[PDB]
Design an enzyme around this catalytic site. Structure first.
Site, short mmCIF file in Angstrom:
data_model
loop_
_atom_site.label_atom_id
_atom_site.label_comp_id
_atom_site.label_asym_id
_atom_site.label_seq_id
_atom_site.Cartn_x
_atom_site.Cartn_y
_atom_site.Cartn_z
N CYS B 30 4.95 28.15 -21.94
CA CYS B 30 5.73 28.78 -23.00
C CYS B 30 6.02 27.79 -24.13
O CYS B 30 6.55 26.70 -23.89
CB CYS B 30 7.05 29.32 -22.42
N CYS B 33 9.87 27.11 -24.85
CA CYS B 33 10.43 26.31 -23.76
C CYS B 33 10.25 24.82 -24.00
O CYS B 33 11.20 24.05 -23.90
CB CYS B 33 9.79 26.69 -22.42
#
Ligand SMILES: [Mg+2]
Lengths: 681, 105
Positions: B30, B33
């Site tokens: 991600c 993230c």
DNA sequence: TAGGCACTGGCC
DNA sequence: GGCCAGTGCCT
């Protein structure tokens, strides 16, 4: 000769009303329309043509128009109407014979878009008429502020309907003349629109008469249906469904759910530079929200219990539970266990079939055992799909008379082989495969109770013996004088070939030859010796070198086609042209075509001989054709004595066929009696 | 100073930790993230004593996130006395996170 | 690159 | 809807 077409209120199965009909008479060159109150006159016009020994042309009349008229005459007029087979021509049957290298929508049951290649124009128009008439009708109502329903277009007779009926006859007549203009099938010196039926069948190529007889007999078979045990399959479904539930429970515990990115729109871009990162999952950037709710009056604001913050991107994700039916999920989990894929699909993706799953080795003991559970799960889904949940499942097709009426295209393959569909009764699991005994046992004459006595019927399974090898023997006889044929029915052809090839086991031969006959790939040939694709090509070369007669046969067939083609087709036993896609496939096409045609003439002659012995065809009679799966037929019989006559008659007919086409190898059949398909095969 | 959780250590490390705990559900694949990761290192380092930051990789520990209905990552859950006080999804900034804590601490 | 159906998954 | 990649079941 007359050309005709009718419009009725439904498909054969439930038709109840005659809407209209149109007749074009070649002897007067005029079109006559018949509205509902003219049904009686319509029928009299057809019977008149039969009184003159004439011909009636319908497009797809063998499966619909002719049987529908019999039914409608009894229901609406309490009249007996039976058009003799010899007086009927079907342009769809003719098209499939003359344009065998093309596919068709099968009267609009198949979506044009899915079929490969081109489609014959006239035939396409006839098959799309219903869907066209339906769209005209809809716009008609949609314009008058009305509402459309199911298929109300067929509930009542109207003028648009009549207009389409007239159009179907002008097109059917156009197709007819286009088909009759083919010199290979219809001698040019004869005008086939001006002859009686006996001249028509006798002066045209033999394949014309044969295909029409096969279509007529197969239409009757579709109408008979195959008796089916609904309860047995419902009980099988319950069982399979429970096993599926349990395999899933065990697999969802062994393989856990995970998260996958889903629902992202904007592309993620590197905050440092700005370089878009197409590989990263799509993100989403909220425009609303903050730590505190917007002020509305020093004094601290009211926190925003909203989860998003404007400008703070995130990756949308979904929860995904392990689905044993997904080859992707399986691929995902086995790698994460230590599996290194070998073969990939020619489109970026690791191959995951039962063949490879059988060779997958992982370190985790439980993960390794789960593979067998996965293979079982896939097979169970296959069975559940075919019998109960698929769109073409058996339980969805059973009719109120307790039978499945599967469709059959008498000439659906280039070679003259028939195709089965809706549902495909030619792909029912065999007794040697999982759950095959139960599936096969659900189909059978025992499930049909005699209309008069209530006693179950008996089944006769009749198979042509090693048909392909005998056809091969026949064709090589001009090169070996029948030695190969002599060995098949006297010696032991299998060890003979075992020595021809360099095979270690006789059974290896039984498998090798069978693969050779349908033209199996070099790979599968290698997989019998253990090797693969290498020993494959090798064997095929060693085999031919020690079987000169086959090499001579292959060389003369190639001489016929190649000189760059000299002709792109082979002549079938009945004279039809059999399109050959590739020179290397010529022999296989020739052999496959011979068996198909022999099987076709055989089932035709068997029924003709039974009817000449006094037996009546149908459930109200003595026997009923239920299934024709290439080299085998399943026949329902009212009694065991009749089943014995059927089996004996089939042998007689097979011998009549070999003699009729001067076959250089004796042909034979074997019959078995029993209550169902599991026992009769 | 950042605590690395697992499915099995979650209950005791978070739910029975008596004190404010900031959990971060993330995944290696991600983008956002990896954006907030550096930030958190700084926060755990600044709020030492007043707060505890913990990360949970949802690919190695798939059984915990579902219990809280994760629909997007990175997700930040502020726990206090075994109960979820506040929640926030998205790659917040060093400043935005600072406001989020102080306001809920 | 046997020949035909048909099923489920994943996608625009 | 349809559309399609991958597979399996029958000869
Ligand atoms: Mg019609």
């Amino acid at each position: 000769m007359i050309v005709s077409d009718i419009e009725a209120n439904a498909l054969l199965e439930s038709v109840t009303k005659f809407h209209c009909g149109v007749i074009y008479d070649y002897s007067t060159a005029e079109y006559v329309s018949y509205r509902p109150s003219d049904f009686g006159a319509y029928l009299d016009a057809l019977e008149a043509e039969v009184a003159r020994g004439g011909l009636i042309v319908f497009h797809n009349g063998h499966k619909y128009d002719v049987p529908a008229l019999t039914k409608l005459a009894k229901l609406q007029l309490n009249r007996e109407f039976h058009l003799p087979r010899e007086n009927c021509i079907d342009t769809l049957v003719l098209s499939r014979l003359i344009h065998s290298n093309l596919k068709d929508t099968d009267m609009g049951l198949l979506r044009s878009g899915k079929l490969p290649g081109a489609l014959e124009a006239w035939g396409y128009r006839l098959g799309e008429m219903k869907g066209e008439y339906k769209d005209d009708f809809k716009r008609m109502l949609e314009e008058q502020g009305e509402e459309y329903v199911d298929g109300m277009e067929w509930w009542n007779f109207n003028e648009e309907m009549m207009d389409y009926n007239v159009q179907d006859v002008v097109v059917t007549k156009a197709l007819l003349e286009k088909l009759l203009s083919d010199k290979h099938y219809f001698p040019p010196e004869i005008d086939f629109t001006d002859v009686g039926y006996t001249t028509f069948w006798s002066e045209s190529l033999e394949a014309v008469d044969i295909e029409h007889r096969a279509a007529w007999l197969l239409a009757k078979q579709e109408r008979n249906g195959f008796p089916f045990d609904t309860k047995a399959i419902e009980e099988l479904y319950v069982e399979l469904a429970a096993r599926r539930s349990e395999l899933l429970r065990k697999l969802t515990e062994t393989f856990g759910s995970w998260y996958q990115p889903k629902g992202g729109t904007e592309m993620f871009c590197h905050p440092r530079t700005g370089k878009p990162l197409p590989k990263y999952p799509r993100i989403k950037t909220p425009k609303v929200g903050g730590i505190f709710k917007k002020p509305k009056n020093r004094e601290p604001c009211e926190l925003d219990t909203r989860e998003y913050v404007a400008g703070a991107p995130y990756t949308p994700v979904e929860h995904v539970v392990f689905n044993p039916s997904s080859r992707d999920h399986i691929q995902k989990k086995l790698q994460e266990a230590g599996w290194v894929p070998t073969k990939y699909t020619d489109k970026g993706a690791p191959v995951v079939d039962d063949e490879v799953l059988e060779g997958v080795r992982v370190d985790d003991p439980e993960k390794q055992a789960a593979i067998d559970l996965i293979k079982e799960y896939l097979m169970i889904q296959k069975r559940i799909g075919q019998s109960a949940e698929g769109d073409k499942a058996w339980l969805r097709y059973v009719a109120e008379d307790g039978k499945i009426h599967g469709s059959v295209n008498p000439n659906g393959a280039v070679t003259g082989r028939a195709t089965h569909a809706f549902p495909n009764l030619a792909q029912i699991p065999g007794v040697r495969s999982p759950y095959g005994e139960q599936c096969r046992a659900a189909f059978g004459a025992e499930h049909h109770l005699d209309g008069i006595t209530g006693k179950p019927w008996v089944q006769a399974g009749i198979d042509a013996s090693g048909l392909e090898l005998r056809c091969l023997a026949h064709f090589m006889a001009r090169f070996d004088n029948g030695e190969y044929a002599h060995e098949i029915l006297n010696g032991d052809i299998h060890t003979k070939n075992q020595i021809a090839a360099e095979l270690p086991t006789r059974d290896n031969a039984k498998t090798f030859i069978y693969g050779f006959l349908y033209g199996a790939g070099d790979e599968k040939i290698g997989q019998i010796v253990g090797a693969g694709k290498e020993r494959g090509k090798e064997l095929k070369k060693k085999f031919l070198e020690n079987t000169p007669a086959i090499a001579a046969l292959r060389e003369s067939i190639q001489q016929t086609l190649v000189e760059k083609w000299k002709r792109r087709w082979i002549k079938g036993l009945d004279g039809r042209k059999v399109h050959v896609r590739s020179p290397h496939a010529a022999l296989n096409t020739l052999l496959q075509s011979a068996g198909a045609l022999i099987c076709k003439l055989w089932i035709i002659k068997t029924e003709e001989m039974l009817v000449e012995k006094g037996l009546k065809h149908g459930w109200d009679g003595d026997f009923a054709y239920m299934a024709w799966v290439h080299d085998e037929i399943q026949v329902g019989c009212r009694t065991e004595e009749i089943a014995q006559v059927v089996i004996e008659t089939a042998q007689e007919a097979m011998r009549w066929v070999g003699d009729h086409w001067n076959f250089r190898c004796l042909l034979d059949t074997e019959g078995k009696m029993g209550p169902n398909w599991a026992i009769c095969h | 100073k950042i605590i690395h959780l697992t499915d099995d250590s979650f209950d005791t490390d978070v739910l029975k930790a008596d004190g404010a705990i900031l959990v971060d559900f993330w995944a290696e694949w991600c983008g956002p993230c990896k954006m907030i990761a550096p930030i958190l290192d700084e926060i755990a380092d600044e709020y030492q004593g007043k707060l505890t930051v913990a990360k949970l990789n949802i690919d190695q520990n798939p059984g915990t996130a579902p219990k809280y209905g994760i629909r997007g990552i990175p997700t930040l859950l502020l726990f206090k006395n075994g109960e979820v006080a506040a929640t926030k999804v998205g790659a917040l900034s060093k400043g935005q996170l600072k406001e989020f804590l102080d306001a809920n601490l």
